[PDB]
């Protein structure tokens, strides 16, 4: 069964055969599409097929399919599942798994870079302090004084689900949010809940509009612990605008390293519940979502005011106008400080090339249009007129429940 | 199986029960989502369940479900089908059918106005000249001197597929597209092929670039005929900018009346191949789409150039900045000339209200996030953080092959 996607801007057609390798499910049916829904304990019974499938993939990619090396490895993993009810990945396997999880991440516009991931194996870690140490080295290596480098750090896999490693932060670096008594929010509204947890766990909040949050780290199923990333490791960029001198006076800055830490890495049935990964920012992530979203910093209005915009009628597009300027300033700031950033035009063009290259050498590229198209200027980026097929491949990154909702407290 | 959708900006949760009454298919499966794909004759046995399904919802909507009247009409249609192999809608059913075809159009952000559709029954029409007349009356009524009103005009239903009524234009009003020897195009690149087909069938093009295309009308499956819409019926808006008075000299205008004419309307099994319908523009449909789309006017370059923006690297966001000004202007021009137009903030906010309404009174509202989200500034509109469920209800508007690929000549 061959499937076709058309680019309606260039009439280019591609043929997806890769969707047949799809194991997981979308949530869609023949009678309903859940394409815009954000979100749609493992026994040896269903593990070896998941293991076998992964090892078949791996040994295929290294062109050793059905070799004695391949067959012994299967046999070896089998006996280990038979006797220990889990199994350990070799280093080569882990690296492959991490890179393909990213490659398979259908909502990621930045996957042209997937094969250049720096994989830190932290499977020997046993304590939160050791987690803190691995994360510091990640941040330092990834940041690289502004010349950002893709990296992922992988903590030990889940076992009986009672001894999980978790990074409780949604990102390694993120600013606090404080609900004031009068209903207003100081800092980043997105992080109010997590801030409160941290504070309960004994964090001394400076209560400023741009305080870096502490790391809240859980090793081996134990209660999480608070650590402060060394300020000198957190690279930040003051936000100014190239024509607007008053923009600097808005007092804004943002951190340079986007590093997501609350997801789950699945490789051959194994689950890595703590697997922080990082790349670099597309400008709109900060400028459109992190400032202008109504449930965020919402400087939108204050930027509009200082531009002396007609803020009466929305048909003046003052909202649209301020949004462009804020994204202009975000790109301007990061470039001026030689901190790696990409604009949404560059990233989408790059992705289209990636996708075509993927269809030719892999027979497909799973892609989530709803998430790949940029949150501003959609139709003037080339992904907008690009049909995309969405399906789920393993290895993968998955969502998992917030740890504070599932964790059993030791004391 | 009582599905829930969440707004992530507001945490409002709605529960969708209406999707269980879905008949048609989406194109997706458990293994693959086709949510971004643009495009995924009836026997007696196929027809009657379709008729019954339609008549059942009709009589429920008028609170006379299971009534003598209901049962009367069911037997009545049933008998006509076994005899004539088809049937005819009562006027009331036609109006209900049409309005609900709009209500169910999951890709339409304008559906809050769905019940105020003006239906023009054109089923007595027999010729292209007749179609032209019904269409001129539609255009004039809809336009209403700039105060636009929704309308649909419905021509005879398909019979045996050889007697089809078809409006060959994609819209009633659209500018011509001529490609120059030079290489590029002038007029409107989307219409290049059709502009050729008109000339190919005898149109004499004014080869300016805002030349309103002729109508190409097909009655009862005959060869189609060219007709020129009276210019005084074609309301146009000169495009100026409220702050940049160099903008006027770009020489741009657009027509006030968006009127889609190539879709098929399906009611209780019956197929209306000619059914032009019209409302009023969302600003972005002309500015983010009919000016800057690289496969159309693509005047972005020209605009930024005499905004003298730094067009050296994409990271200056000059395209974005220009895109916004063009759209500010479109809105400004229409409002200035008192021609109806809605901005993308207003329409999306309207739709959220409409959506809530439909969950409340109907139990659901099929919606295609990929088309509902405007082509600019998506994330600062309320629909962006709105989860939506997409499914196919009937009555519906559907796509159909372009006539020139089909029509036996
Ligand atoms: C190197 C430059 C990268 C860029 C520019 C980039 C860009 C993006 C953007 C803009 C999104 C949409 C998220 C949103 O708007 O909320 C996204 C999603 C995602 N990215 Fe990438 N990314 C990069 C690197 C990476 C890396 C290194 C990984 C993993 C190792 C990764 C994995 C993912 C995943 C799993 C998602 C889906 C999130 C979800 O399902 O909620 N990305 N990316
Ligand atoms: C009155 C104001 C209206 C507004 C503002 C509006 C807005 C829109 C917009 C922005 C689209 C996106 C399509 C594109 O960008 O190319 C759309 C699609 C659509 N509209 Fe509405 N519309 C209106 C009235 C109507 C009426 C009166 C009908 C029919 C009774 C209708 C039926 C449809 C259908 C069927 C589609 C999708 C066609 C497809 O599946 O490709 N609309 N509309
Ligand atoms: C406004 N969107 C918030 C929704 C969201 C949820 C989760 C989770 N869990 C993770 C998310 O992250 C997406 C993502 C992941 C990794 C990224 C990397 C490595 C770099 C980058 N520039 N953006 C990313 C973006 C987003
Ligand atoms: C660039 N996208 C083109 C895809 C498209 C195809 C067809 C068809 N056939 C019909 C389409 O119609 C969209 C539409 C239909 C009716 C509208 C009405 C009545 C009013 C309005 N403002 N926009 C409409 C927009 C679109
Ligand atoms: C490929 C892509 O899905 C397709 O071009 C769609 C995307 N969203 C759209 N949205 C609107 N409003 N109009 C369109 O024509 C499209 N085109
Ligand atoms: C409801 C909606 O699907 C949800 O808010 C999605 C839409 N598209 C998105 N796209 C990106 N890049 N990031 C997001 O967080 C979202 N959110
Ligand atoms: Zn789907």
UniProtKB/Swiss-Prot annotation, chain A:
UniProt tissue specificity: Isoform N-NOS-1 is expressed in brain and colorectum. Found in the Auerbach's plexus of the enteric nervous system. Isoform PNNOS is expressed in the penis, urethra, prostate, and skeletal muscle, and coexists with the cerebellar nnos in the pelvic plexus, bladder and liver, and is detectable in the cerebellum.
Modifications after synthesis and translation: Ubiquitinated; mediated by STUB1/CHIP in the presence of Hsp70 and Hsp40 (in vitro).
Family: Belongs to the NOS family.
Compartments reported by the entry: Cell membrane, Sarcolemma; Cell projection, Dendritic spine
Binding site for L-arginine: 171, 280-281, 285
Gene label: Nos1
Protein name as catalogued: Nitric oxide synthase 1
Sites where the protein binds (6R)-L-erythro-5,6,7,8-tetrahydrobiopterin: 36, 370-371, 384
Binding site for heme b: 108, 399
Function: Produces nitric oxide (NO) which is a messenger molecule with diverse functions throughout the body. In the brain and peripheral nervous system, NO displays many properties of a neurotransmitter. Inhibitory transmitter for non-adrenergic and non-cholinergic nerves in the colorectum. Probably has nitrosylase activity and mediates cysteine S-nitrosylation of cytoplasmic target proteins such SRR. Inhibitory transmitter for non-adrenergic and non-cholinergic nerves in the colorectum.
Effect the entry attributes to changing residue 281 to F: No decrease in nitric-oxide synthase activity
Subunit structure: Homodimer. Interacts with DLG4 (via N-terminal tandem pair of PDZ domains); the interaction possibly being prevented by the association between NOS1 and CAPON. Forms a ternary complex with CAPON and RASD1. Forms a ternary complex with CAPON and SYN1. Interacts with ZDHHC23. Interacts with NOSIP; which may impair its synaptic location. Interacts with HTR4. Interacts with SLC6A4. Interacts with VAC14.
Domain note: The PDZ domain participates in protein-protein interaction, and is responsible for targeting nNos to synaptic membranes. Mediates interaction with VAC14.
UniProtKB/Swiss-Prot annotation, chain B:
Residues annotated for L-arginine binding in this entry: 171, 280-281, 285
Signal peptide range in chain numbering: none
Tissue expression summary: Isoform N-NOS-1 is expressed in brain and colorectum. Found in the Auerbach's plexus of the enteric nervous system. Isoform PNNOS is expressed in the penis, urethra, prostate, and skeletal muscle, and coexists with the cerebellar nnos in the pelvic plexus, bladder and liver, and is detectable in the cerebellum.
Binding site for heme b: 108, 399
Binding site for (6R)-L-erythro-5,6,7,8-tetrahydrobiopterin: 36, 370-371, 384
Record note on modification: Ubiquitinated; mediated by STUB1/CHIP in the presence of Hsp70 and Hsp40 (in vitro).
Protein's cellular compartments: Cell membrane, Sarcolemma; Cell projection, Dendritic spine
Domain remarks in the Swiss-Prot or TrEMBL record: The PDZ domain participates in protein-protein interaction, and is responsible for targeting nNos to synaptic membranes. Mediates interaction with VAC14.
Family to which this protein belongs: Belongs to the NOS family.
Protein purpose: Produces nitric oxide (NO) which is a messenger molecule with diverse functions throughout the body. In the brain and peripheral nervous system, NO displays many properties of a neurotransmitter. Inhibitory transmitter for non-adrenergic and non-cholinergic nerves in the colorectum. Probably has nitrosylase activity and mediates cysteine S-nitrosylation of cytoplasmic target proteins such SRR. Inhibitory transmitter for non-adrenergic and non-cholinergic nerves in the colorectum.
Subunit structure and binding partners: Homodimer. Interacts with DLG4 (via N-terminal tandem pair of PDZ domains); the interaction possibly being prevented by the association between NOS1 and CAPON. Forms a ternary complex with CAPON and RASD1. Forms a ternary complex with CAPON and SYN1. Interacts with ZDHHC23. Interacts with NOSIP; which may impair its synaptic location. Interacts with HTR4. Interacts with SLC6A4. Interacts with VAC14.
Protein name: Nitric oxide synthase 1
Organism placement in taxonomy: Eukaryota, Metazoa, Chordata, Craniata, Vertebrata
Chain's gene name: Nos1
Span within the parent record: 299 to 716 of 1429
